[PDB]
């Protein structure tokens, strides 16, 4: 409706008997393949991304936002737990870091 791509903003310009809209949009570029999984199995629990997606570059698993590659460590702060690992099709085994663990470890 407001240009090709994800619409950011628009600017109006007057024209003879008309209007010209300059649509400023965000276009994704330089995409890269990653291996993806619906959920992460850890401690018999299924973890799902709170806002992003699980991606793998070949050896390590990360969670990133869907529209830009920004890999982050899979923690309990960016994932949520729902059920065990027996139900979700395609769940893979990976560790889930706990930020509170070094606090009581020290």
């Amino acid at each position: 409706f407001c240009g090709k791509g994800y619409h950011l903003m628009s600017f109006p310009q007057s024209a003879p008997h008309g209007v010209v809209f300059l649509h400023v949009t965000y276009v994704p570029a330089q995409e890269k393949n990653f291996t993806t999984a619906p959920a992460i199995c850890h401690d018999g629990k299924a973890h799902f991304p709170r806002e992003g997606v699980f991606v793998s570059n070949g050896t390590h698993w990360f969670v990133t936002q869907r529209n830009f590659y920004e890999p982050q460590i899979i923690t309990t702060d960016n994932t949520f737990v729902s059920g065990n690992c027996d139900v979700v099709i395609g769940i893979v085994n990976n560790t889930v870091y706990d930020p509170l663990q070094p606090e009581l470890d020290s």
Partner: protein, 170 residues
């Protein structure tokens, strides 16, 4: 073919030019309408040969290789169910090319979700895409993943009911 009639008709001026111009404007407007509706992608996307979409069946909407018209069963049913100086101009886009445009749109929305509509087509597994759509309507991803077989069965049943309803209603 009457010369006397044309000589008398010339007394009325450029009425004929106005009518021809209006009809020409309508005729080009129809082609513009078809371009606006169907030609919204400049890439002709194709489905993978293996139809592994996590239980989701799209055979009733994807083009049938057995048919010479390369139409879907639903599109084939739709085409079957629709039945002195005058000329009929053919449309600029033929039915097979319009079907090809719809096939490209279907392949893009199945293999890439909404990414192809906003830029480059980014591949995503179809259950994950459905989970994204679930999050769009405010339902968590887990609900989709846990009940994936049920959702796929319901979707296939609904698509079959659509074909049956179109085939059974005049």
């Amino acid at each position: 073919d009457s010369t006397e009639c044309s000589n008398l008709l010339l007394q009325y001026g450029s009425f004929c030019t106005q009518l021809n111009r209006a009809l020409t404007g309508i005729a080009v407007e129809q082609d513009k309408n078809t371009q606006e509706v169907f030609a919204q992608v400049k890439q002709i996307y194709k489905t993978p040969p293996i139809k592994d979409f996590g239980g989701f069946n799209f055979s009733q909407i994807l083009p049938d290789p057995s048919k010479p018209s390369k139409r879907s069963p639903i599109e084939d049913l739709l085409f079957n169910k629709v039945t002195n100086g005058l000329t009929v101009l053919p449309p600029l886009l033929t039915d097979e090319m319009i079907a090809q445009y719809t096939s490209a749109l279907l392949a893009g929305t199945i293999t890439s979700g909404w990414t192809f509509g906003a830029g480059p087509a980014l591949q995503i597994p179809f259950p994950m895409q459905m989970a994204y759509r679930f999050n769009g309507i405010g339902v968590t991803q887990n609900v989709l993943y846990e009940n994936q077989k049920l959702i796929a069965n319901q979707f296939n049943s609904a698509i079959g009911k659509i074909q049956d309803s179109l085939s059974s209603t005049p």
